[PDB]
């Protein structure tokens, strides 16, 4: 009647560490790192996007046997250095993070000033140029375990990188403003989401009352300059991509020795024997 006998643990096989922790999809990882054998291990890169509760992380990663190697990273908590200092999670923040990552990567590789990308965000789909005139840098999108739905911040980061200048293959089936029944993309809604018009409308509605937007209302942020702030942030990111925020006591508990543990057990058994 007890299922967890000794035989259960004798015959139990554990899963991979990251599968137990619940952070890696290994089927997807195998298919993403798979490459044609005739290429003999040519470099291949994935742009990995991870959205936490209060920040979003975008990385350019190449796989390796010893361990993955990170080429360039960008975080949303550096946007205040480039301008906007509120939200840091919405769609506009995602777009800014993607653009910053693309600019940093191109500058690091030295191919910058040859692939300037798109200057002004129009929210329109343009097919990426790939082998399948010098070709752009290419990476494939990695969303992990996030559910892919229309109008998602992972795809916002994707659009940011594409407008920055990287060549990430995609279709406009998941951008904000795509009508499935009509198979068309409306650029107006996409631009509004990229520049945070919905955030401004919500802020105005909340301010027209009598917790939400607490720090927003505490600051003097008026819901009529967010688009200008985001445009200035785009300009600053484009101008100076390599910028960031301005700049061992021990606590570990020592583990007992085996001899000490045995001595403690012997003392305890002597104590109970005496008490008996």
């Amino acid at each position: 009647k007890v299922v967890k006998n000794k035989a259960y643990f004798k015959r139990f096989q554990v899963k991979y560490r990251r599968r137990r922790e619940g952070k890696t999809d290994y089927h997807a990882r195998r298919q993403m790192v798979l490459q044609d054998k005739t290429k003999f291990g040519s470099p291949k890169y994935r742009l990995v996007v991870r959205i936490t509760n209060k920040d979003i992380i975008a990385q350019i990663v190449q796989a390796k046997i010893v361990g993955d190697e990170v080429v360039m990273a960008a975080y949303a908590h550096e946007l205040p250095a480039f301008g906007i200092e509120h939200g840091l999670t919405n769609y506009a923040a995602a777009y800014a993070t993607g653009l910053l990552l693309a600019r940093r990567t191109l500058a690091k590789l030295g191919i910058a000033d040859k692939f300037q990308g798109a200057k002004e965000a129009d929210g329109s789909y343009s097919a990426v140029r790939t082998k399948k005139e010098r070709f752009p840098f290419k990476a494939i999108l990695d969303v992990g375990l996030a559910r892919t739905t229309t109008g998602a911040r992972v795809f916002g980061v994707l659009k940011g990188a594409v407008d920055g200048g990287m060549a990430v293959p995609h279709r406009p089936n998941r951008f904000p403003g795509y009508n499935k029944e009509k198979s068309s993309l409306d650029a107006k809604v996409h631009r509004d989401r990229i520049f945070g018009k919905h955030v401004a409308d919500y802020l105005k509605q909340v301010k027209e009352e009598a917790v939400q937007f607490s720090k927003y209302m505490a600051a003097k942020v008026l819901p009529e300059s967010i688009e200008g702030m985001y445009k200035k942030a785009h300009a600053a990111i484009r101008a100076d991509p390599s910028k960031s925020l301005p700049k061992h006591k021990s606590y570990k508990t020592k583990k007992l020795s085996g001899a000490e543990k045995r001595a403690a057990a012997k003392a305890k058994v002597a104590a109970i024997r005496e008490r008996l």
Partner: protein
């Protein structure tokens, strides 16, 4: 009675205890090029491009590489002669062979010794055989004999 493709493979195409699962990422990232030595070991969890049971455990030479497959040349004795068979398998059923690890180490050591001699460095000392004679100074000496207790402790009842 029956002579099918996978007859008599109940224990051959099976996973070891507590070692089930699909191939890992190290297999996917391994590079194979024409002219390498590989071992053909079937992975029972793939079931695609599996070699025939005869070739399980043989070592050969790669002669062709495709997007997902490898071509290997394997010796097979038939009657009075040896045939060179060409088999096509998926990349998950092969692994790099270490059959020349000792020979490659031998060549590298010779090159290092040659460089040191030309540079006039100090060569390492030569090992001596253990099969030579010498004086033995014993530390503990015991008498070897059969005792009465040896026989009494051989009747478990």
């Amino acid at each position: 009675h029956s002579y099918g493709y996978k007859s008599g493979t109940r224990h051959l195409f099976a996973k070891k205890f507590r070692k089930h699962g699909v191939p890992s990422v190290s297999t996917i990232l391994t590079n194979i090029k024409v002219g390498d030595y590989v071992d053909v070991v079937a992975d029972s969890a793939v079931r695609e491009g599996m070699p025939h049971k005869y070739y399980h455990g043989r070592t050969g030479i790669v002669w062709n590489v495709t997007p997902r497959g490898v071509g290997v040349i394997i010796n097979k004795p038939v009657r009075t002669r040896t045939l060179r068979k060409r088999i096509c398998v998926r990349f998950e059923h092969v692994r790099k062979s270490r059959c020349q690890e000792a020979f490659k180490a031998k060549e590298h050591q010779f090159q290092a010794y040659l460089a040191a001699k030309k540079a006039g460095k100090a060569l390492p000392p030569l090992q001596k055989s253990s099969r030579l004679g010498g004086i033995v100074r014993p530390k503990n000496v015991e008498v070897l004999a059969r005792r009465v207790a040896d026989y009494e402790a051989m009747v478990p009842y």
